[PDB]
Write a protein that binds this ligand. Sequence first.
Ligand code: MG
Ligand code: MG
Ligand code: ZN
Lengths: 478, 180, 406, 243, 179
Amino acid sequence: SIAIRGYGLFAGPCKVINAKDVDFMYVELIQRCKQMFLTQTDTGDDRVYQMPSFLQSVASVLLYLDTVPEVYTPVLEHLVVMQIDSFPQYSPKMQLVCCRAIVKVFLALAAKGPVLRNCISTVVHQGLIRICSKPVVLPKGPESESEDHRASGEVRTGKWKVPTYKDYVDLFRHLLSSDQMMDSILADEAFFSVNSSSESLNHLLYDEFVKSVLKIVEKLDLTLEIDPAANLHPAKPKDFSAFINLVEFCREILPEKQAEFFEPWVYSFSYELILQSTRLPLISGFYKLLSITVRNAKKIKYFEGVSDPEKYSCFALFVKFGKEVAVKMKQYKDELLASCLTFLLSLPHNIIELDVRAYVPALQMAFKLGLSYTPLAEVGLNALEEWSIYIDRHVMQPYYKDILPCLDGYLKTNWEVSALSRAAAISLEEIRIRVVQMLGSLGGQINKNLLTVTSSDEMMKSYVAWDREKRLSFAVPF
Amino acid sequence: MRHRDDERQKVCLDIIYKMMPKLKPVELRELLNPVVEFVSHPSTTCREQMYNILMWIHDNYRDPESETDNDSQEIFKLAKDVLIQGLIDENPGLQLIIRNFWSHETRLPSNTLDRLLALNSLYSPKIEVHFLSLATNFLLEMTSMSPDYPNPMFEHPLSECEFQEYTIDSDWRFRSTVLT
Amino acid sequence: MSSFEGQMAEYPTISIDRFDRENLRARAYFLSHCHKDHMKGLRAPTLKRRLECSLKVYLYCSPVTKELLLTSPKYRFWKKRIISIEIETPTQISLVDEASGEKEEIVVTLLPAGHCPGSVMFLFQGNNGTVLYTGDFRLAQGEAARMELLHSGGRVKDIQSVYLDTTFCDPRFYQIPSREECLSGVLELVRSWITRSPYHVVWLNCKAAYGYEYLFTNLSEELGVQVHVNKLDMFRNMPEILHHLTTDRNTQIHACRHPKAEEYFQWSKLPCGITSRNRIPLHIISIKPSTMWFGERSRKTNVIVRTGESSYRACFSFHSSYSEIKDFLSYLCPVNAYPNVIPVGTTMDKVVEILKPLCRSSQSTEPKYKPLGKLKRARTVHRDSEEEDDYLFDDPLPIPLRHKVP
Amino acid sequence: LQGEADQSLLTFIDKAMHGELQKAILELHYSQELSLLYLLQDDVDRAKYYIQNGIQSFMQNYSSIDVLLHQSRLTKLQSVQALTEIQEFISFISKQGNLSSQVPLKRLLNTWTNRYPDAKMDPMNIWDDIITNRCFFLSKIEEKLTEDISSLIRSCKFSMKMKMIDSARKQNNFSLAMKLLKELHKESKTRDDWLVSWVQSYCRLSHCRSRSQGCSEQVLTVLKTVSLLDENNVSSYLSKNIL
Amino acid sequence: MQLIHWFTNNKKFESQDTVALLEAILDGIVDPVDSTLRDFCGRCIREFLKWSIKQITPQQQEKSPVNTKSLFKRLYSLALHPNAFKRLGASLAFNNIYREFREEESLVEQFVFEALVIYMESLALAHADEKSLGTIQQCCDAIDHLCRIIEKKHVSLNKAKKRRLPRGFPPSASLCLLD
Ligand SMILES: [Mg+2]
Ligand SMILES: [Mg+2]
Ligand SMILES: [Zn+2]
């Protein structure tokens, strides 16, 4: 690093740069990095803690020479991929150093030409593939890395647990928000301020992440092979795991930067997801991704004032897809039905205003399942609040008598003055508090539908006697 | 005794139980005032000694009219109250010991109606959540001492019975048709 | 290290593992074990001058601690002032004042710590409740429920305060392997190394003076070779340890120490001046049992790691890990708990907020009723001027009259 | 809450809350009243604590009422709007960004003027509670700030008062309607559109009242309306507003 | 199992207890959610038919198939229902009872053509369903079972006897395989 910085500071103003030695030092650094990190697959206790310096030096060298040897482009892309893979093995400050190194390499690659700008696309794609290849996060800890199943000769100190997708979310957030880091990079070396300073690196990386997600989605094989919903097995379980990890990573990454750059990707992403979902109606990750997309679209007011033609095409697409999902979801189960209800209740109010009768049973099922599954109750409460706030009152009026009675089950689960006078995932409590606040926010003309005569007639059925005469006479023998 | 120590409080209760048959009513009362504080003690071995002390007090202070000095009365009342509270003890063995103490013929009659009358005296505003269960158990435990108790409830098995055919299309048939 | 000020909050008249500044006025001294971080001020000139001017102040410790302490020539002035106490034997200590004839009795109980030769705990019982001082202890999970003297009739005793060892009280040292696993690994490695030629030797870079005698004794029993140490006269009254050590340098296993032993090993030379026997060079490998190095790993590691062609590291800790500390403190369930030492990475506040959820502080209370008096408006600013037409509206309702006086 | 000054209730609550028995029943059945009293004393934290306690108490009570007791469940449910509005005002007055501009105040006033009780199924006690609480909240809001915000608050109070009078007329509460109209007669003549609305409400009340009376009394009770209807001073306003 | 054994020895067409038990089992077999209860109710219908045949003499069963008629009429009512789960339950019941139904000559001669027509109509109604439900597969299995039953006993089905007239057939005094 000292030699590279000195060579820069000297040959910069002196104008003595000669490609016959810059390429020499470039090949030297690349071969050393390959023999140190790539081929040397052993106990590299210190190599990972010094790889960012190697990457920074390689970027500083690569920005100088103009004729980059094409044979050393793979070694580089795979090197950056493996450096991204080693991100969870860093301290909170070493993680920032790694992010700075990655941003520096990207800036050095986004200034030569398209033949090296494609390297950014392929390295982002391979890094996302590597991240999705990680094991799936189970609800509770795996039996291997459990509380008291430490195998003989196992030392659980430091970062002993296997990394998951949740460890690269900070790396990707730093990559998608690298603006002050770019300022620190450019202001360090004199040549960085001379070449093209791409301030739109965040938008570039966001577009590359979106297109890599699309490419991974259209590449997987989510086919199920062998009462009928029990003997169904995935053809390639690793593809299923990678798809789950990709859905979770998208949930974590996509709403970044207030979904500013997601606006042009709305229609294409939505169409691709809807196609993959209508070709595979038994996969819940597609519904999760569609829910994320619809929430990101609502965050940027994509469907506001629809009733460019692309916005209207997406609106008309979602209008039909919601009806299709509502019709076909009448035979799903816990995970699939939960994802379908989440998607149907994530839709904007503009689509719901067209036909509330088609989406009322979805909200009813969500409220009924929310007694055991809290997230469904939360989604239902959010959907009901949105509908009561934005949809016209005259349209929602005849549906409260069918929606609100479903909320009575949350309120049905000591002392009073007449006794003390003689004496002289969120919790379900939060759900009850939100239901009370929901009933209070709705006026007295609406919340009265929580107690309908039909609900009382239906609930009085559990209080009638089975038989109107006593049959089982048992004489207790004394 | 107030100090929290299982072995220390246990040997203190042992000393009290051994010195009790030679104590005066006022002394026994002022010494039992802190003894009844072991009803809410975590140790299942100190509560046993406390219940032994209380059962001795109950059995040796039965006289409500004779030996009336306004001290034996309060001692008997407190002992009876804590023995009644002992019917909901957390330990199943100690609770069984207490309920066998109460279920004796000397303290609860053997007649069904007499025991039903006497169960109202075993009530206290402390044991209200479990009073009905205790009363039902005390009433149903008298069924074991009955000749019909070990006999079968029905004479003939289904292998030699007649399948009753409700052929009469009476007013029941109209309701059965309306139902389904 | 020992961040303890050698002075309990309940019994300030006794100082433990610290005799530096305010402990010169104490009435009794206690010594957990014979580590240097727990012996500050024990050789001070002021303490030397105080000992020769008093007769009722003594130093209580384990018999093994007394043997290890009196061996050193610098601490031989304590020979007539040290009173050794057997473990698991409740004894009564008299805290008699020197100046005034005042006196105070306290009951102390020594409990084994499993750390180093002579390491014990201190369980005090007096007027201010029961306190426990576990100075540099080591307990596996599920062993706190096996201490007889910490139980009173099958249940844990009422402990007021616990001055526990928090050396590895941080999520970095989650589950340190038991010392038996490290022992087996080191035994296998040393066997596979020295079984080749009589010229293959194994160094044991042991930083602490005491605490690694377990490894030495078990390696000697499983290999028949005797470990080499600098001094062994300290174990002259301990036959089970003395017959496993040797001062001769003609042995394979070595555990000698030297301030510049690293460069010596780099030059293929043990800390002892010998580098080769019979002019045949020696092949040396270094095994350094430590724990702080393993607490900085970033991936899955093993008990026996190889950091070089002739270098190894072993996970051998004489301190309880984070999970073991949590289990111990949750089983004791004391009112208070004070950390004796703060980890290098962690700070005081984080250790305190880790230990606090384990203490017996399950007592909450509603906030005090804040009264509301002298309302913030004196005059009725919302009063009307009472001008009406009185004909568009019906007659006013007459004021009711109630003559009932109960 | 209506603006009077009497240390009777405050001293009573102070004396009662300092007792193990009285405090335990005051925090159980009158927690909303305690929250309102703390809001009167400019104590937002205690007020929020007591309104949360009141929400919990309502939940505990409603969860214990039998399902078949429909009227009791409805009576218990008729207070959720008041409780939630109190909690909403507590949350609104806590933040500082609402006192700078008037956009959040206008939003709150628009949410209040679109959230009314049922005009024919909610009794007049619920209406009285909600309207009094809203007026007290608007008074407390105006007390902190000092078309300005004061005129907006006055217009909102007048509109809510008129809506309550309409609801009282629709429920045959003619005496309460007259009592509420007499209190608004003075301030309705200050502006121009308020006078017309007040006269029209009074005429509607006199028309609704003149149905269960004799023919000799109907003429008497409706003769008071023609002089207000064919008045000539508001003819200028009537000639510019066709409604 | 013992309750099913005891409540299948009635003598009248619609016994209240037998009808109640059969309705409980048939409502458990059409449960859209639970599959274990559905399989257990299939086993229960199997035992029901078995002990309805086992507890009657062959000369009496030819005269009046009391429980078989009720079971088959309820299966026909469930097979023509617009709900897919009821048709699936009827198909599962037949796939569970086909091995016990074919061991009685008179039961076959009386019910085979009616069951075949009913399940053909059920397979036709199952056209608008999805392949993930399983109505098509179970209905095809039932139709194949009926086809094998017809093939094995085609010598007796070629005669013009008085059988149960299937759905959508003109009134006649006989029913053959040519029809
Ligand atoms: Mg130490
Ligand atoms: Mg130590
Ligand atoms: Zn040596």
